[PDB]
Structures are given as structure tokens and as C-alpha cells.
Amino acid sequence: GKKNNPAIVIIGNNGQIHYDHQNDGASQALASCQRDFRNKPYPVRAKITYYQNTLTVMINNGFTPDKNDYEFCAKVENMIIPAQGHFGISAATGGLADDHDVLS
Amino acid sequence: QGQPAEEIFESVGDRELRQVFEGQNRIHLEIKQLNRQLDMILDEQRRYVSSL
Structure with a gap:
């Protein structure tokens, strides 16, 4: 209810x-x-x-056909992750419906 | 809580121009940054002219 969304959230968890x-x-x-x-x-x-150990996020808006028009919005520093880990993508759809399509 | 069904319905042409309207908002913040960047430039040289 805080009008944050749509937003991109960086959360790092150790499993707890x-x-x-x-x-x-x-x-x-x-x-x-x-x-x-x-x-x-x-x-x-x-x-x-x-x-x-800093995790920098740069985004292309999708309002342009330029691929490289990446813009910084948020980041963290001294970020801790399992250096051996699995990259993964996942999406959910609730009562309201979206098509989450990943081209590349 | 309840959820109305008006939120679901849309016209594509309007949603396209809504994206155009959202595209115009980028220029606004660009102008706002440009104004404040011009404002601070004017003030600092005003001190710099007086200090000189």
C-alpha cells in the first residue's frame, strides 16, 4: 500500500x-x-x-529500441553470496494476470 | 479487501499513449535536473564574482 510498486527489489538472503x-x-x-x-x-x-562485492543494477527502459541504454537505479555494496551458486529466473502471477516473457 | 473489475479493462491505443505520457515524464525530471543545475551554476559564480 506504499505505492512502491512497480519496483525492482534487491534482497540477499542466507536462507534464514x-x-x-x-x-x-x-x-x-x-x-x-x-x-x-x-x-x-x-x-x-x-x-x-x-x-x-558491489551489485550494480542498470536498466534499459524498453521505451527505446537501443539495447545499451542502461540506467542505474539501485545497488548494494559488500554483498555476500555463495560464490558457487545457481543462476535462476522465476515469475509469479496472482489474481491479476501478467505474461512474464524473457527473450534473452 | 475486494477487487473491482474496472482495473482489468483497457484499450490498447490508450495504453500506448499512456506509455508515451510516461515517456514525457522522463523529460520532466530531465528539465527539473537542468533547472537546478542551472540554478546552482548561477549562484556559485555570483559568489565567485564577488569573491574575485
């Missing part, structure tokens, strides 16, 4: 933090950028950059 979606995880939110990403004329592109 329960993700509460009722606040949309604003309590355990390490960093966030309040940006709409639905209904774009061009597909949305994002740059996720973990380098020197």
Missing part, C-alpha cells in the same frame, strides 16, 4: 529470511528502485553487475 510479500519485502529490502517495467514498446533490458 522469510520473504513476506504483504509489504512486498520492503522490510528485508537491501536496495530498491521504484520503476515501472510493464507494457513497454520494446523489451526491457537490465544490467546486473556483481563486481568487487
Whole structure:
């Protein structure tokens, strides 16, 4: 109810933090950028950059056909992750309906 | 809580121009940054002219 969403939320968990979606995880939110990403004329592109233990997020809006028009919105530093880990993508659809389609 | 059904319905042409309207909002923040950037430039040289 805080009008944060649509937003991109960075949350890093060690396995002991329960993700509460009722606040949309604003309590355990390490960093966030309040940006709409639905209904774009061009597909949305994002740059996720973990380098020197900082996790930098740069986003292309999808309002342009340019691929490289990435814009910074949020990041964290001294980020801790299992250096051996699995990359994964996942999406959910609730009562309201979205098509979550990943081109590349 | 309840959920109305008006939120679901849309016309595509209007939603396209809504994206155009959202595209115009980028220029607004761009203008707002440009104004404040011009405002701080004017003030600092005003101190710099007086200090000189």
C-alpha cells in the first residue's frame, strides 16, 4: 500500500529470511528502485553487475529500441553470496494476470 | 479487501499513449535536473564574482 510498486527489489538472503510479500519485502529490502517495467514498446533490458562485492543494477527502459541504454537505479555494496551458486529466473502471477516473457 | 473489475479493462491505443505520457515524464525530471543545475551554476559564480 506504499505505492512502491512497480519496483525492482534487491534482497540477499542466507536462507534464514522469510520473504513476506504483504509489504512486498520492503522490510528485508537491501536496495530498491521504484520503476515501472510493464507494457513497454520494446523489451526491457537490465544490467546486473556483481563486481568487487558491489551489485550494480542498470536498466534499459524498453521505451527505446537501443539495447545499451542502461540506467542505474539501485545497488548494494559488500554483498555476500555463495560464490558457487545457481543462476535462476522465476515469475509469479496472482489474481491479476501478467505474461512474464524473457527473450534473452 | 475486494477487487473491482474496472482495473482489468483497457484499450490498447490508450495504453500506448499512456506509455508515451510516461515517456514525457522522463523529460520532466530531465528539465527539473537542468533547472537546478542551472540554478546552482548561477549562484556559485555570483559568489565567485564577488569573491574575485
